[PDB]
Design a protein around this ligand. Structure first.
Ligand SMILES: *Cc1c(COP(=O)(O)O)cnc(C)c1O
Length: 217
């Protein structure tokens, strides 16, 4: 039924939205089945779990891997080696480090900046004013491609609160784009299994769906 859930979900998305199939807590065989249904973008929250899966998927030539979880400095080199996108960039120090590493490795990861717009004790994220302050410095990084913002809803929001959070993410990104015209801030990484339709309606370009596609762990 992975193939059926994928087709059902894709039929609903406009061309502007790409789906990331979030395979965290599912094995390589799940990913293989999604791929046979035409899925190419997969998301993981742990670097080592993705490294292991990648070693079991040598049959898949054209995967794009997205890192969705908190990235500490001790996994930064592996992150840059093994992921195409890193959505969870939540600080200047991390951004600067990824940029130096990417230089040394000859890679150019595509990054989203993970921004905290509402209180959430479960997730890290940039303070909006801290992010406005660092934009000149982020603008000058040469070895990463900063492409957008990532926003994750605090647990237990209502539909209406979620809808307003995603709208706020859209408007904040536009404000940053105006303040940093060097940045190609074209993306909004938002929406998961329960709220992706709200995210799409407010301008998401990447949605991140796990459970609705793969079922539970
Ligand atoms: C777990 C997770 C997802 C997928 O969540 P579902 O509710 O299973 O769709 C997407 N993005 C991030 C950052 C996650 O941690």
């Amino acid at each position: 039924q992975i193939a059926e859930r994928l087709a059902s979900l894709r039929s609903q998305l406009p061309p502007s939205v790409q789906l990331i199939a979030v395979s965290k807590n599912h094995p390589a065989a799940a990913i293989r089945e999604a791929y046979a249904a035409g899925q190419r973008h997969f998301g993981e929250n742990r670097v080592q779990e993705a490294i292991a899966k990648q070693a079991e998927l040598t049959d898949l030539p054209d995967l794009t891997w997205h890192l969705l979880g908190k990235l500490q400095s001790n996994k930064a080199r592996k992150a840059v080696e093994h992921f195409d996108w890193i959505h969870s960039v939540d600080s200047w120090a991390l951004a600067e480090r990824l940029d130096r590493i990417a230089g040394e490795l000859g890679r150019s990861p595509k990054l989203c900046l993970q921004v905290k717009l509402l209180p959430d004790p479960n997730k890290a994220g940039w303070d909006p004013a801290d992010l406005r302050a660092e934009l000149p410095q982020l603008s000058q990084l040469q070895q990463v491609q900063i492409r957008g913002l990532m926003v994750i809803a605090p647990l237990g929001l209502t539909a209406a609160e979620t809808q307003a959070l995603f709208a706020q993410a859209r408007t904040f990104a536009a404000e940053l784009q105006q303040q940093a015209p060097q940045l190609r801030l074209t993306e909004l990484s938002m929406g998961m299994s329960s709220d992706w339709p709200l995210a799409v309606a407010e301008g998401a370009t990447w949605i991140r769906v796990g459970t609705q596609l793969f079922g539970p762990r």
